[PDB]
Amino acid sequence: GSHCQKTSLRVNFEDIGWDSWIIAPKEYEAYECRGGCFFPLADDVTPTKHAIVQTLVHLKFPTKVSKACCVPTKLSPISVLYKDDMGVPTLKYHYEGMSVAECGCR
Amino acid sequence: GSHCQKTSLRVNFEDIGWDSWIIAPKEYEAYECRGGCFFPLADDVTPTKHAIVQTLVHLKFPTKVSKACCVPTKLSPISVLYKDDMGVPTLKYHYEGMSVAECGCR
Ligand SMILES: [Cl-]
Ligand SMILES: [Cl-]
Ligand SMILES: [Cl-]
Ligand SMILES: [Cl-]
Ligand SMILES: [Cl-]
Ligand SMILES: [Cl-]
Ligand SMILES: [Cl-]
Ligand SMILES: [Cl-]
Ligand SMILES: [Cl-]
Ligand SMILES: [Cl-]
Ligand SMILES: [Cl-]
Ligand SMILES: [Cl-]
Ligand code: NA
Ligand code: NA
Ligand code: NA
Ligand code: NA
Ligand code: NA
Ligand code: NA
Question: Which Cys pairs does UniProt list as disulfide-bonded (chains A, B)?
């Protein structure tokens, strides 16, 4: 519906220069938040008042003030197999903030 | 330093069609978050891992994946004088989420 939402983003750790310390997995589903912040809103979302006020000021003064932005509002962990100070392969069971759980306009 | 930060944004309630129910004040300091999300980061900020990973994927695939976005990460209340169901002028002492307290890349 052209509104702020979660969509797929497969991240390869080698592509981002993290494969020097992340051994596994090779790739993971990080998701991303894409779409607009405009009126009217999706009826099942959690908007802030600052995002609604800024979006309205944007409409009136579009060259000076930016619209609201679609961003992750909650993140989930993943497990990684990483190399510790000596190099030993070690499991990090809950590696926080790697994957989008919820999107919203902020 | 061209990095994500708090900057002034004076909001007039009439400009955004809220003066029908907000009587006072006329205008308030809402702030906004402006600036880039790029490497290297400001050394005193609170970045998420998803924002760092997405920014790096953006660098590699700039046409497909967007960069991180500079947004409010904490909001503060203001007091408003508002009209209640009958029209009586009523103070809302803590009207949440009207003003930026902190900015960050998300
Ligand atoms: Cl991709
Ligand atoms: Cl996965
Ligand atoms: Cl709406
Ligand atoms: Cl629509
Ligand atoms: Cl809010
Ligand atoms: Cl962690
Ligand atoms: Cl203005
Ligand atoms: Cl003020
Ligand atoms: Cl950095
Ligand atoms: Cl710099
Ligand atoms: Cl994080
Ligand atoms: Cl409130
Ligand atoms: Na990718
Ligand atoms: Na995954
Ligand atoms: Na303008
Ligand atoms: Na304004
Ligand atoms: Na104020
Ligand atoms: Na590309």
Answer: 4-70, 33-103, 37-105
CB atoms within 10 A of CB A84: 10
Bridge partners for B61 per DSSP: none
Contact at CB, A75 and B48, closer than 8 angstroms: yes
Residues of A whose CB is below 8 A from B53 = 11, 16, 30, 98
Two tokens, residue B80: 């408003």
DSSP at B36: B
Closest residue of chain A to B75, computed from CA coordinates: A50
Which own/partner contact pairs does A39-46 have at CB distance under 8 Å and 24+ positions apart?
Answer: A41/A3, A41/A105, A42/A1, A42/A3, A42/A4, A45/A3, A45/A4, A45/A104, A45/A105, A46/A73, A46/A102, A46/A104
Domains and CATH numbers, chain A: 5-105 (2.10.90.10)
* Nearest-Cα residue of chain B relative to residue A32: B54
* Structure obtained using: X-ray
Resolution (A): 2.1
